[PDB]
Amino acid sequence: MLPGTFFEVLKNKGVVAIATQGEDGPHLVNTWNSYLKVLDGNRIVVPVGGMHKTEANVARDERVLMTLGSRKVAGRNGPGTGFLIRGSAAFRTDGPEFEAIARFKWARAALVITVVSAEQTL
Amino acid sequence: MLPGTFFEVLKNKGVVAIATQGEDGPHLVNTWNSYLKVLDGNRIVVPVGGMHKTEANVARDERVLMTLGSRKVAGRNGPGTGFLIRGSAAFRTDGPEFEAIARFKWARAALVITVVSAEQTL
Ligand SMILES: Cc1cc2nc3c(=O)[nH]c(=O)nc-3n(C[C@H](O)[C@H](O)[C@H](O)COP(=O)(O)O)c2cc1C
Ligand SMILES: Cc1cc2nc3c(=O)[nH]c(=O)nc-3n(C[C@H](O)[C@H](O)[C@H](O)COP(=O)(O)O)c2cc1C
Ligand SMILES: [Cl-]
Ligand SMILES: [Cl-]
């Protein structure tokens, strides 16, 4: 399950980064800390406006990496912390996962990350 | 020439993300907005403490992606913006490139990103 300090990071503002595998190299896109919706102990849902290249990548290789953090949350050995999340991704345009982020009217889809690991890297 | 909005983001707090190509998929690591040092029109230096896997990746494939942003800086459609940087990476342990981040007493090296493109993605 996702750890307590991760939820503390979500309560603070910041830029989330999401890396996928493309045909010719990695691709890297963003969301905001505040936009992540956690379901159960292992699903993180992201509202999708663009992410067209990201979606194409995920369709061929479901594996994603995600990082996020905050200066305002104590880490393992000082002020500030962050996490590296590894998981499998899928895009949804309806159902409970889309409904989880449907408050964002600009969302054309939901990016659903099923987390396999969460490492506190700072 | 990095744009003024990019410099504004650097004046605000946040988590920077750096993606490299690994042997089995992408790799994704972090620094802080305030740690970045801009050398000139297109070089950004990051203090390196860990980044051992990142360094190994860069030796195989110099191409890197970097994202950063801030809720506090104006984007195209209201508050909040960020950037995708595409370029090539190198590691240095001396010279002006290292001196640029030498204030970080823990730095084992400097990661120098030569920027090919900077895109405001919000
Ligand atoms: C700080 C920040 C937050 C962003 N938030 C989102 C978001 O929540 N959803 C989204 O689809 N794109 C968001 N974007 C834009 C994406 O990072 C990306 O540029 C866009 O979705 C296109 O993705 P693609 O290159 O995979 O086509 C954000 C960008 C930044 C800098
Ligand atoms: C918010 C945040 C800031 C970080 N800042 C640095 C940094 O400035 N330099 C560094 O080497 N590692 C930093 N780290 C740790 C790296 O992201 C990474 O986990 C570590 O360097 C190992 O890199 P590697 O997986 O390439 O071996 C930071 C981590 C977080 C979450
Ligand atoms: Cl946020
Ligand atoms: Cl910062």
Side-chain angles (χ1 to χ4, degrees), chain B residues 18-49:
Chain B
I18 301 162
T20 52
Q21 185 65 73
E23 288 163 308
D24 197 39
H27 195 66
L28 185 60
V29 298
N30 300 112
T31 189
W32 295 108
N33 288 14
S34 70
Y35 281 17
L36 300 192
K37 180 67 177 199
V38 179
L39 292 183
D40 52 22
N42 78 162
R43 295 184 297 154
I44 302 166
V45 188
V46 173
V48 176

PDB file of all heavy atoms in Angstrom, chain B residues 18-49:
ATOM      1  N   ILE B  18      14.111  14.441 -14.168  1.00  0.00           N
ATOM      2  CA  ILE B  18      15.097  14.179 -15.227  1.00  0.00           C
ATOM      3  C   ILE B  18      14.966  12.723 -15.662  1.00  0.00           C
ATOM      4  O   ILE B  18      15.176  11.797 -14.863  1.00  0.00           O
ATOM      5  CB  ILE B  18      16.537  14.431 -14.731  1.00  0.00           C
ATOM      6  CG1 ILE B  18      16.696  15.876 -14.250  1.00  0.00           C
ATOM      7  CG2 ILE B  18      17.563  14.096 -15.823  1.00  0.00           C
ATOM      8  CD1 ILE B  18      17.915  16.106 -13.364  1.00  0.00           C
ATOM      9  N   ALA B  19      14.641  12.533 -16.936  1.00  0.00           N
ATOM     10  CA  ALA B  19      14.448  11.197 -17.500  1.00  0.00           C
ATOM     11  C   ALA B  19      15.575  10.834 -18.447  1.00  0.00           C
ATOM     12  O   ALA B  19      15.980  11.641 -19.282  1.00  0.00           O
ATOM     13  CB  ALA B  19      13.118  11.115 -18.227  1.00  0.00           C
ATOM     14  N   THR B  20      16.067   9.610 -18.299  1.00  0.00           N
ATOM     15  CA  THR B  20      17.087   9.062 -19.195  1.00  0.00           C
ATOM     16  C   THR B  20      16.585   7.743 -19.759  1.00  0.00           C
ATOM     17  O   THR B  20      15.599   7.172 -19.268  1.00  0.00           O
ATOM     18  CB  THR B  20      18.424   8.822 -18.460  1.00  0.00           C
ATOM     19  OG1 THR B  20      18.205   8.049 -17.275  1.00  0.00           O
ATOM     20  CG2 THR B  20      19.077  10.161 -18.085  1.00  0.00           C
ATOM     21  N   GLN B  21      17.267   7.267 -20.793  1.00  0.00           N
ATOM     22  CA  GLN B  21      16.988   5.949 -21.342  1.00  0.00           C
ATOM     23  C   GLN B  21      17.851   4.897 -20.652  1.00  0.00           C
ATOM     24  O   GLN B  21      19.074   4.942 -20.745  1.00  0.00           O
ATOM     25  CB  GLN B  21      17.278   5.931 -22.851  1.00  0.00           C
ATOM     26  CG  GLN B  21      16.898   4.599 -23.518  1.00  0.00           C
ATOM     27  CD  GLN B  21      15.401   4.318 -23.489  1.00  0.00           C
ATOM     28  OE1 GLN B  21      14.634   4.947 -24.209  1.00  0.00           O
ATOM     29  NE2 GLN B  21      14.987   3.358 -22.663  1.00  0.00           N
ATOM     30  N   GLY B  22      17.203   3.957 -19.966  1.00  0.00           N
ATOM     31  CA  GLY B  22      17.888   2.805 -19.373  1.00  0.00           C
ATOM     32  C   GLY B  22      17.830   1.622 -20.327  1.00  0.00           C
ATOM     33  O   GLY B  22      17.232   1.704 -21.397  1.00  0.00           O
ATOM     34  N   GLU B  23      18.435   0.510 -19.928  1.00  0.00           N
ATOM     35  CA  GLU B  23      18.510  -0.669 -20.794  1.00  0.00           C
ATOM     36  C   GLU B  23      17.183  -1.411 -20.937  1.00  0.00           C
ATOM     37  O   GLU B  23      16.950  -2.072 -21.956  1.00  0.00           O
ATOM     38  CB  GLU B  23      19.617  -1.612 -20.317  1.00  0.00           C
ATOM     39  CG  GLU B  23      21.010  -1.070 -20.600  1.00  0.00           C
ATOM     40  CD  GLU B  23      22.098  -1.751 -19.791  1.00  0.00           C
ATOM     41  OE1 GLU B  23      21.969  -1.839 -18.550  1.00  0.00           O
ATOM     42  OE2 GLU B  23      23.094  -2.181 -20.401  1.00  0.00           O
ATOM     43  N   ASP B  24      16.310  -1.289 -19.937  1.00  0.00           N
ATOM     44  CA  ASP B  24      15.008  -1.967 -19.972  1.00  0.00           C
ATOM     45  C   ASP B  24      13.793  -1.030 -20.006  1.00  0.00           C
ATOM     46  O   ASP B  24      12.645  -1.481 -19.986  1.00  0.00           O
ATOM     47  CB  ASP B  24      14.883  -2.964 -18.813  1.00  0.00           C
ATOM     48  CG  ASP B  24      13.763  -3.979 -19.029  1.00  0.00           C
ATOM     49  OD1 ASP B  24      13.585  -4.443 -20.180  1.00  0.00           O
ATOM     50  OD2 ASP B  24      13.054  -4.301 -18.053  1.00  0.00           O
ATOM     51  N   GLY B  25      14.040   0.270 -20.084  1.00  0.00           N
ATOM     52  CA  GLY B  25      12.961   1.245 -19.975  1.00  0.00           C
ATOM     53  C   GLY B  25      13.527   2.561 -19.491  1.00  0.00           C
ATOM     54  O   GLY B  25      14.727   2.662 -19.270  1.00  0.00           O
ATOM     55  N   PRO B  26      12.660   3.576 -19.314  1.00  0.00           N
ATOM     56  CA  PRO B  26      13.142   4.869 -18.832  1.00  0.00           C
ATOM     57  C   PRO B  26      13.660   4.798 -17.400  1.00  0.00           C
ATOM     58  O   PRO B  26      13.376   3.836 -16.672  1.00  0.00           O
ATOM     59  CB  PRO B  26      11.886   5.764 -18.884  1.00  0.00           C
ATOM     60  CG  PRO B  26      10.870   5.004 -19.692  1.00  0.00           C
ATOM     61  CD  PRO B  26      11.201   3.560 -19.507  1.00  0.00           C
ATOM     62  N   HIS B  27      14.416   5.822 -17.014  1.00  0.00           N
ATOM     63  CA  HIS B  27      14.790   6.040 -15.621  1.00  0.00           C
ATOM     64  C   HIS B  27      14.441   7.473 -15.296  1.00  0.00           C
ATOM     65  O   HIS B  27      14.549   8.342 -16.151  1.00  0.00           O
ATOM     66  CB  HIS B  27      16.285   5.805 -15.403  1.00  0.00           C
ATOM     67  CG  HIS B  27      16.667   5.653 -13.962  1.00  0.00           C
ATOM     68  ND1 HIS B  27      16.259   4.588 -13.189  1.00  0.00           N
ATOM     69  CD2 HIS B  27      17.413   6.441 -13.151  1.00  0.00           C
ATOM     70  CE1 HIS B  27      16.746   4.721 -11.967  1.00  0.00           C
ATOM     71  NE2 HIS B  27      17.446   5.839 -11.917  1.00  0.00           N
ATOM     72  N   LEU B  28      14.032   7.715 -14.058  1.00  0.00           N
ATOM     73  CA  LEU B  28      13.510   9.014 -13.693  1.00  0.00           C
ATOM     74  C   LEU B  28      14.019   9.396 -12.309  1.00  0.00           C
ATOM     75  O   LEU B  28      13.805   8.662 -11.332  1.00  0.00           O
ATOM     76  CB  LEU B  28      11.975   8.981 -13.718  1.00  0.00           C
ATOM     77  CG  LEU B  28      11.228  10.298 -13.478  1.00  0.00           C
ATOM     78  CD1 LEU B  28      11.601  11.332 -14.538  1.00  0.00           C
ATOM     79  CD2 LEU B  28       9.727  10.062 -13.479  1.00  0.00           C
ATOM     80  N   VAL B  29      14.708  10.536 -12.247  1.00  0.00           N
ATOM     81  CA  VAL B  29      15.261  11.058 -10.983  1.00  0.00           C
ATOM     82  C   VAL B  29      14.891  12.511 -10.807  1.00  0.00           C
ATOM     83  O   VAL B  29      14.303  13.119 -11.703  1.00  0.00           O
ATOM     84  CB  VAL B  29      16.793  10.889 -10.875  1.00  0.00           C
ATOM     85  CG1 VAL B  29      17.168   9.409 -10.914  1.00  0.00           C
ATOM     86  CG2 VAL B  29      17.527  11.708 -11.966  1.00  0.00           C
ATOM     87  N   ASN B  30      15.261  13.074  -9.653  1.00  0.00           N
ATOM     88  CA  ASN B  30      14.838  14.422  -9.300  1.00  0.00           C
ATOM     89  C   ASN B  30      15.946  15.331  -8.809  1.00  0.00           C
ATOM     90  O   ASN B  30      16.995  14.869  -8.352  1.00  0.00           O
ATOM     91  CB  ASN B  30      13.766  14.357  -8.210  1.00  0.00           C
ATOM     92  CG  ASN B  30      12.552  13.588  -8.649  1.00  0.00           C
ATOM     93  OD1 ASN B  30      12.276  12.502  -8.136  1.00  0.00           O
ATOM     94  ND2 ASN B  30      11.821  14.136  -9.615  1.00  0.00           N
ATOM     95  N   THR B  31      15.687  16.634  -8.915  1.00  0.00           N
ATOM     96  CA  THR B  31      16.391  17.642  -8.132  1.00  0.00           C
ATOM     97  C   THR B  31      15.363  18.705  -7.703  1.00  0.00           C
ATOM     98  O   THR B  31      14.164  18.470  -7.815  1.00  0.00           O
ATOM     99  CB  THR B  31      17.653  18.196  -8.857  1.00  0.00           C
ATOM    100  OG1 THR B  31      18.404  19.011  -7.952  1.00  0.00           O
ATOM    101  CG2 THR B  31      17.297  19.001 -10.081  1.00  0.00           C
ATOM    102  N   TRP B  32      15.824  19.829  -7.166  1.00  0.00           N
ATOM    103  CA  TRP B  32      14.946  20.915  -6.764  1.00  0.00           C
ATOM    104  C   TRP B  32      15.110  22.103  -7.700  1.00  0.00           C
ATOM    105  O   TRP B  32      16.211  22.345  -8.194  1.00  0.00           O
ATOM    106  CB  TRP B  32      15.311  21.374  -5.361  1.00  0.00           C
ATOM    107  CG  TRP B  32      15.106  20.378  -4.257  1.00  0.00           C
ATOM    108  CD1 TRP B  32      16.086  19.705  -3.575  1.00  0.00           C
ATOM    109  CD2 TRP B  32      13.855  19.962  -3.670  1.00  0.00           C
ATOM    110  NE1 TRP B  32      15.523  18.900  -2.611  1.00  0.00           N
ATOM    111  CE2 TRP B  32      14.162  19.045  -2.642  1.00  0.00           C
ATOM    112  CE3 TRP B  32      12.503  20.274  -3.918  1.00  0.00           C
ATOM    113  CZ2 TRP B  32      13.166  18.423  -1.853  1.00  0.00           C
ATOM    114  CZ3 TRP B  32      11.515  19.651  -3.131  1.00  0.00           C
ATOM    115  CH2 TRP B  32      11.859  18.753  -2.105  1.00  0.00           C
ATOM    116  N   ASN B  33      14.028  22.863  -7.913  1.00  0.00           N
ATOM    117  CA  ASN B  33      14.089  24.079  -8.743  1.00  0.00           C
ATOM    118  C   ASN B  33      15.267  24.970  -8.365  1.00  0.00           C
ATOM    119  O   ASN B  33      15.997  25.440  -9.227  1.00  0.00           O
ATOM    120  CB  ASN B  33      12.807  24.923  -8.649  1.00  0.00           C
ATOM    121  CG  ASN B  33      11.616  24.300  -9.360  1.00  0.00           C
ATOM    122  OD1 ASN B  33      11.632  23.129  -9.723  1.00  0.00           O
ATOM    123  ND2 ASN B  33      10.563  25.095  -9.551  1.00  0.00           N
ATOM    124  N   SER B  34      15.436  25.212  -7.064  1.00  0.00           N
ATOM    125  CA  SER B  34      16.452  26.150  -6.593  1.00  0.00           C
ATOM    126  C   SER B  34      17.896  25.670  -6.759  1.00  0.00           C
ATOM    127  O   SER B  34      18.831  26.458  -6.580  1.00  0.00           O
ATOM    128  CB  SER B  34      16.203  26.510  -5.129  1.00  0.00           C
ATOM    129  OG  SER B  34      16.474  25.410  -4.289  1.00  0.00           O
ATOM    130  N   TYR B  35      18.075  24.392  -7.099  1.00  0.00           N
ATOM    131  CA  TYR B  35      19.409  23.814  -7.248  1.00  0.00           C
ATOM    132  C   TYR B  35      19.973  24.054  -8.641  1.00  0.00           C
ATOM    133  O   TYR B  35      21.191  24.048  -8.817  1.00  0.00           O
ATOM    134  CB  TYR B  35      19.376  22.312  -6.981  1.00  0.00           C
ATOM    135  CG  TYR B  35      19.351  21.887  -5.537  1.00  0.00           C
ATOM    136  CD1 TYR B  35      19.003  22.776  -4.508  1.00  0.00           C
ATOM    137  CD2 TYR B  35      19.648  20.574  -5.200  1.00  0.00           C
ATOM    138  CE1 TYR B  35      18.975  22.347  -3.181  1.00  0.00           C
ATOM    139  CE2 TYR B  35      19.619  20.141  -3.889  1.00  0.00           C
ATOM    140  CZ  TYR B  35      19.291  21.027  -2.886  1.00  0.00           C
ATOM    141  OH  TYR B  35      19.275  20.561  -1.591  1.00  0.00           O
ATOM    142  N   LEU B  36      19.092  24.260  -9.621  1.00  0.00           N
ATOM    143  CA  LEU B  36      19.524  24.480 -11.003  1.00  0.00           C
ATOM    144  C   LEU B  36      20.345  25.752 -11.155  1.00  0.00           C
ATOM    145  O   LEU B  36      20.002  26.793 -10.590  1.00  0.00           O
ATOM    146  CB  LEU B  36      18.321  24.525 -11.960  1.00  0.00           C
ATOM    147  CG  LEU B  36      17.435  23.278 -12.046  1.00  0.00           C
ATOM    148  CD1 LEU B  36      16.464  23.352 -13.220  1.00  0.00           C
ATOM    149  CD2 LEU B  36      18.246  21.998 -12.133  1.00  0.00           C
ATOM    150  N   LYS B  37      21.434  25.650 -11.914  1.00  0.00           N
ATOM    151  CA  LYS B  37      22.259  26.812 -12.231  1.00  0.00           C
ATOM    152  C   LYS B  37      22.340  26.937 -13.742  1.00  0.00           C
ATOM    153  O   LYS B  37      22.764  26.004 -14.434  1.00  0.00           O
ATOM    154  CB  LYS B  37      23.656  26.679 -11.603  1.00  0.00           C
ATOM    155  CG  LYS B  37      24.611  27.858 -11.869  1.00  0.00           C
ATOM    156  CD  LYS B  37      24.146  29.133 -11.180  1.00  0.00           C
ATOM    157  CE  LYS B  37      25.138  30.265 -11.383  1.00  0.00           C
ATOM    158  NZ  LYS B  37      24.923  31.339 -10.373  1.00  0.00           N
ATOM    159  N   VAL B  38      21.911  28.085 -14.252  1.00  0.00           N
ATOM    160  CA  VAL B  38      21.958  28.339 -15.688  1.00  0.00           C
ATOM    161  C   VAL B  38      23.274  29.019 -16.023  1.00  0.00           C
ATOM    162  O   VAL B  38      23.587  30.078 -15.475  1.00  0.00           O
ATOM    163  CB  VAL B  38      20.760  29.192 -16.157  1.00  0.00           C
ATOM    164  CG1 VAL B  38      20.852  29.464 -17.656  1.00  0.00           C
ATOM    165  CG2 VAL B  38      19.443  28.495 -15.830  1.00  0.00           C
ATOM    166  N   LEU B  39      24.046  28.401 -16.915  1.00  0.00           N
ATOM    167  CA  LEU B  39      25.383  28.900 -17.235  1.00  0.00           C
ATOM    168  C   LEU B  39      25.387  29.986 -18.283  1.00  0.00           C
ATOM    169  O   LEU B  39      26.200  30.913 -18.218  1.00  0.00           O
ATOM    170  CB  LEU B  39      26.296  27.772 -17.699  1.00  0.00           C
ATOM    171  CG  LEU B  39      26.691  26.729 -16.659  1.00  0.00           C
ATOM    172  CD1 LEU B  39      27.656  25.735 -17.284  1.00  0.00           C
ATOM    173  CD2 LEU B  39      27.305  27.377 -15.430  1.00  0.00           C
ATOM    174  N   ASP B  40      24.505  29.843 -19.263  1.00  0.00           N
ATOM    175  CA  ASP B  40      24.452  30.748 -20.412  1.00  0.00           C
ATOM    176  C   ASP B  40      23.113  30.588 -21.108  1.00  0.00           C
ATOM    177  O   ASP B  40      22.111  30.245 -20.475  1.00  0.00           O
ATOM    178  CB  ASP B  40      25.607  30.444 -21.379  1.00  0.00           C
ATOM    179  CG  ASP B  40      25.689  28.966 -21.769  1.00  0.00           C
ATOM    180  OD1 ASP B  40      24.672  28.241 -21.665  1.00  0.00           O
ATOM    181  OD2 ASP B  40      26.781  28.524 -22.184  1.00  0.00           O
ATOM    182  N   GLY B  41      23.100  30.800 -22.420  1.00  0.00           N
ATOM    183  CA  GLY B  41      21.880  30.679 -23.204  1.00  0.00           C
ATOM    184  C   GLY B  41      21.248  29.296 -23.256  1.00  0.00           C
ATOM    185  O   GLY B  41      20.050  29.190 -23.499  1.00  0.00           O
ATOM    186  N   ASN B  42      22.025  28.232 -23.049  1.00  0.00           N
ATOM    187  CA  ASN B  42      21.446  26.883 -23.181  1.00  0.00           C
ATOM    188  C   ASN B  42      22.018  25.765 -22.309  1.00  0.00           C
ATOM    189  O   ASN B  42      21.797  24.591 -22.605  1.00  0.00           O
ATOM    190  CB  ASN B  42      21.407  26.441 -24.664  1.00  0.00           C
ATOM    191  CG  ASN B  42      22.759  25.963 -25.200  1.00  0.00           C
ATOM    192  OD1 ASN B  42      22.814  25.279 -26.225  1.00  0.00           O
ATOM    193  ND2 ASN B  42      23.837  26.315 -24.525  1.00  0.00           N
ATOM    194  N   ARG B  43      22.761  26.103 -21.264  1.00  0.00           N
ATOM    195  CA  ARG B  43      23.277  25.051 -20.373  1.00  0.00           C
ATOM    196  C   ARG B  43      22.746  25.214 -18.965  1.00  0.00           C
ATOM    197  O   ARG B  43      22.781  26.309 -18.410  1.00  0.00           O
ATOM    198  CB  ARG B  43      24.810  24.985 -20.387  1.00  0.00           C
ATOM    199  CG  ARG B  43      25.379  24.560 -21.740  1.00  0.00           C
ATOM    200  CD  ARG B  43      26.891  24.418 -21.680  1.00  0.00           C
ATOM    201  NE  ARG B  43      27.534  25.697 -21.377  1.00  0.00           N
ATOM    202  CZ  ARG B  43      28.716  25.826 -20.782  1.00  0.00           C
ATOM    203  NH1 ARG B  43      29.396  24.749 -20.389  1.00  0.00           N
ATOM    204  NH2 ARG B  43      29.210  27.034 -20.561  1.00  0.00           N
ATOM    205  N   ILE B  44      22.233  24.113 -18.413  1.00  0.00           N
ATOM    206  CA  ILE B  44      21.690  24.063 -17.060  1.00  0.00           C
ATOM    207  C   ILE B  44      22.499  23.020 -16.299  1.00  0.00           C
ATOM    208  O   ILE B  44      22.711  21.908 -16.797  1.00  0.00           O
ATOM    209  CB  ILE B  44      20.191  23.669 -17.056  1.00  0.00           C
ATOM    210  CG1 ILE B  44      19.355  24.655 -17.887  1.00  0.00           C
ATOM    211  CG2 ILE B  44      19.647  23.515 -15.608  1.00  0.00           C
ATOM    212  CD1 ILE B  44      17.967  24.153 -18.209  1.00  0.00           C
ATOM    213  N   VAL B  45      22.957  23.383 -15.103  1.00  0.00           N
ATOM    214  CA  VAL B  45      23.767  22.472 -14.285  1.00  0.00           C
ATOM    215  C   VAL B  45      23.007  22.042 -13.035  1.00  0.00           C
ATOM    216  O   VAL B  45      22.349  22.857 -12.382  1.00  0.00           O
ATOM    217  CB  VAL B  45      25.120  23.096 -13.906  1.00  0.00           C
ATOM    218  CG1 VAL B  45      26.008  22.070 -13.230  1.00  0.00           C
ATOM    219  CG2 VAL B  45      25.829  23.603 -15.158  1.00  0.00           C
ATOM    220  N   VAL B  46      23.112  20.753 -12.725  1.00  0.00           N
ATOM    221  CA  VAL B  46      22.447  20.112 -11.585  1.00  0.00           C
ATOM    222  C   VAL B  46      23.531  19.514 -10.677  1.00  0.00           C
ATOM    223  O   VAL B  46      24.430  18.827 -11.172  1.00  0.00           O
ATOM    224  CB  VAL B  46      21.534  18.962 -12.083  1.00  0.00           C
ATOM    225  CG1 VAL B  46      20.939  18.155 -10.911  1.00  0.00           C
ATOM    226  CG2 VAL B  46      20.408  19.513 -12.978  1.00  0.00           C
ATOM    227  N   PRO B  47      23.442  19.747  -9.349  1.00  0.00           N
ATOM    228  CA  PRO B  47      24.387  19.098  -8.445  1.00  0.00           C
ATOM    229  C   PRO B  47      24.087  17.604  -8.317  1.00  0.00           C
ATOM    230  O   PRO B  47      22.937  17.205  -8.060  1.00  0.00           O
ATOM    231  CB  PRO B  47      24.156  19.819  -7.113  1.00  0.00           C
ATOM    232  CG  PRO B  47      22.735  20.262  -7.180  1.00  0.00           C
ATOM    233  CD  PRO B  47      22.488  20.616  -8.624  1.00  0.00           C
ATOM    234  N   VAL B  48      25.127  16.793  -8.488  1.00  0.00           N
ATOM    235  CA  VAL B  48      24.977  15.347  -8.453  1.00  0.00           C
ATOM    236  C   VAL B  48      25.491  14.783  -7.145  1.00  0.00           C
ATOM    237  O   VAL B  48      26.666  14.945  -6.815  1.00  0.00           O
ATOM    238  CB  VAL B  48      25.755  14.695  -9.628  1.00  0.00           C
ATOM    239  CG1 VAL B  48      25.691  13.174  -9.541  1.00  0.00           C
ATOM    240  CG2 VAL B  48      25.203  15.182 -10.963  1.00  0.00           C
ATOM    241  N   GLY B  49      24.605  14.112  -6.421  1.00  0.00           N
ATOM    242  CA  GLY B  49      24.986  13.379  -5.208  1.00  0.00           C
ATOM    243  C   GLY B  49      24.974  11.891  -5.496  1.00  0.00           C
ATOM    244  O   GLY B  49      26.005  11.203  -5.390  1.00  0.00           O
TER     245      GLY B  49
END
